[PDB]
Amino acid sequence: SVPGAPNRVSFAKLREPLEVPGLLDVQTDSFEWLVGSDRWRQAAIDRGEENPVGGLEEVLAELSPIEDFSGSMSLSFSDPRFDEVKASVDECKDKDMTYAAPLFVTAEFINNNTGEIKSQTVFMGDFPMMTEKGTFIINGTERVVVSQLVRSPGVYFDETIDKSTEKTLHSVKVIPGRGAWLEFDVDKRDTVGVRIDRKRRQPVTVLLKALGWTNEQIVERFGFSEIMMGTLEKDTTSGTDEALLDIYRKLRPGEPPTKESAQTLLENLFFKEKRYDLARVGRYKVNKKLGLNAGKPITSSTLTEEDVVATIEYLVRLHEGQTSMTVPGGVEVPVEVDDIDHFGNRRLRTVGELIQNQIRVGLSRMERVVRERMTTQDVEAITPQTLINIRPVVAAIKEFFGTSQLSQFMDQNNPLSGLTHKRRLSALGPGGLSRERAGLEVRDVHPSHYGRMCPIETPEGPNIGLIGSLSVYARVNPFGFIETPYRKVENGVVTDQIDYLTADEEDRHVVAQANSPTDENGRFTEDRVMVRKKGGEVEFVSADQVDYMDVSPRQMVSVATAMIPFLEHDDANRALMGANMQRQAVPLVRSEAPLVGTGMELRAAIDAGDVVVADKTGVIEEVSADYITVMADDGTRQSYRLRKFARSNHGTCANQRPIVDAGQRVEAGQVIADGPCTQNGEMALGKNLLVAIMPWEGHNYEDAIILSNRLVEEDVLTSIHIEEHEIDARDTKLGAEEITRDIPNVSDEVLADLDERGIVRIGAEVRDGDILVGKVTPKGETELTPEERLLRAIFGEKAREVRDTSLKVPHGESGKVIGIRVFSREDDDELPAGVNELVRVYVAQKRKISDGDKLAGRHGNKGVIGKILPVEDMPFLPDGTPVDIILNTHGVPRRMNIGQILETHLGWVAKAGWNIDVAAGVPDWASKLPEELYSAPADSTVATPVFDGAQEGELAGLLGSTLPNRDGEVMVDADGKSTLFDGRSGEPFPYPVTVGYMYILKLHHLVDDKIHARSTGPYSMITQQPLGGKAQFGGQRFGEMECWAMQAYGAAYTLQELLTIKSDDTVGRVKVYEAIVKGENIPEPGIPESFKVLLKELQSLCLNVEVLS
């Protein structure tokens, strides 16, 4: 497999014919196509393409050439070339730059009148590039562009039933995606109407005549369907010219009707590439659907003369009932109704196409003024620069990378989160569906997800169903259709002829399961095989009817879902919860790979990029906590920087540590360093803890969890959290506010940790309310009150012109300062307008597990930590081992996630080695185990691949073959249960309980970030109500339902006091505070601002609203 590959025996019985492809290929291949890299060219030409064109070249060719209105000048662009990136990734991230490369294009100007030629290279600007991890470094932040899901333009056929007087009507709408509309629909009057540009129903014969058809040809060719005969009978147009004139009159009656303009408008409407285009994917879709112009390549971006007639003929065939059709000049194709949820119609807009669209818009905006500058300047004095402004294109590309919904912050919580984020399929954004629309119609699992979109893993938030993840075995078709691999089957024998097919290509075949038993040679051993039909239905067919076969059992699950052991035993809802929870695991101080897992732990770690892999074979020159040096066989040195204690976007600590030593031979692709949540190159999101399944004094009641104090003492569930505090100093109308150690009206003890320039020293410890960096602002008018005047006269402290505005540690936060960054205009830093200085301080803290912190496994079992008992209190095994965690029994069977019990049993089996009595012959249960899995030592790691894992019988048999402990006795019997002594009373529990090892992980939902409180604080400017939305001093919302509850209680006084005194009652609020502080009884509430304001407003409308007794 891979060079390192820590030994992890697998329970798989099937053979993998195809290795898992590059998980981050979707984000890289699209961009390689966009910039037309050499390797992309080689791959495209080797596929069977001639003269392939990249995205940038395609856009330039579409725009070029451009000719002026006079027709005497022409401008063209060609040969886009890229330069070396300005700086490296690390430098750009440190200095908040943008990782980009200069872009150059060869522009050529031709003077038609004379013949002058001007060729030169124009600087297009800095094109944002991407790293090897499929991320963009924008202003020092790692952003990710998620592939969008859109409806491919083309011709679609639908049929509905009229709900007024029964019967059915069929329609066809042509979606170009860049032009106008053109559809044909059938009414209940035995006719065929065409509604051009969605304006008004017109006869189809009118359109036919307009194109240049006559009655004789229509009656000679369209002699199959009677409805069209009736339409022609109803038609009043005689000649072709009248049809054009009639269409022009019906379209725009206002303008004068003339034959020439009538033809020109229709010619302009759809038969021009400058007004109507199919985006070079609609043409392919129409060719595949209608079947015209098959074989030969097509470059036209309009509707062919035969396309319209073929579409109309297909519509009438569909109404007629014909299941087959063919036209001269094409290939016979079937007849059926299309649906919008099917992926033969839904394409994928990857990062390359998303960038291409914005580049196209920018180039159009530039050309708008390019032609104007041509028409406003003098001739024989014009060079390419003098008529090319690069401002608009750069502005457009910059705006797309900082405002577009598709491009957003990369989830840096852990490697798996980032990996899943990169390969995400969103169904919203520019040109997509709204978040408040498409209910239970587009978010349902269509039978076409199988092999192209994971049907179980999806966000549970507002975006349920709209957002999904690509499957393990899937790669986007150059056109943009997700295709999946399948094994060719001929004459009932499976062969090694893997073929990638799309959804529509798959609807014409019969595919079988991957686990279907097969003979040694390859023939099918059974007769009836389970397969999938063309309708997305499962059926048993003959062995000869099998056409294809799945590559592997886990062809439908995603990367996140494939990390869940025993996924076939968990319910769909629980599997979804676990898959979405696995992306919220905070990296721990010391990671450890799971005892029981799948085969996806390794790959997911390497593809995520959170590890360092040797580029070429060599010997480790030296190893340090900061970098690794390796000498290759060719004598070329390589040095890898190890980013140490680096803050992730979400606040988790991201750091790497070497796992190699000097003199170690390393092969290409071997992991030499591991990331935050990786051990020996395998993902280690959580920890293996000893778990006993039993209720305990009600402390684990309602999904609560009891933990041992050992986890706290040994830092089993401890994490590092880093936060950044930023503050700026700028020029103001009263002067420029400066950062200074000196602060007015404050003691010298509070600022004992400040440095010479007024910033907290690195390594200092800070709690809430501590000064991080001094800052003062000009105040202005003082006008001291006599009380203050006398008070400061007795003290003698004269007035100070400045007011303290130093940065303070937010309430509830504490830690140590680990880094300080300073930017200033004095040193030519690129600060925003008016800002003189900027200071960032990083505070890192060592957060241990504590009560209320969420904690969950991989099977959707979640819970807060209700109590942390001391070591002696926890139940302990007879050998004296105290269990680390206790999970309530009542919550397992109901949630229908029995897979966690299997994980527990197999984890116990893995922790203590096993030895099957194979000396006398393989037992019946062990006859299926691979030869390598008959015996393993203690602390072994095993793999149970999803849908091809350990069977229940094999696990039950293994449970009865576990090795003894140091004393020489077995703790867990054949049933998976063990006796536990009570830690408080000492009496053994009356019945044995399930005990094992479970892999559980700490979620980011910590208590420290979810605690709020208010007594008195900031108030809104307009409503005068307490403001919220922030954890410092945010107020709670008292909705109308709570008011109903209070009214039901009859709690009149509480409701009044809560609606007025504690909200928008300025007069009485201060009185209430004064009464509370003075010990006086609270006064009666007044009248809320919400009523006085209402009264004044309603009076302002000339309404004489008055009160009376």
Binding site: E436, R437, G439, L440
Partner: peptide, 15 residues
């Protein structure tokens, strides 16, 4: 999932 118009049209007479 549901807007005001659909929720309003949900409880119409429909008869």
């Amino acid at each position: 999932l549901i807007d005001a118009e659909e929720l309003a049209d949900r409880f119409k007479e429909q008869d």
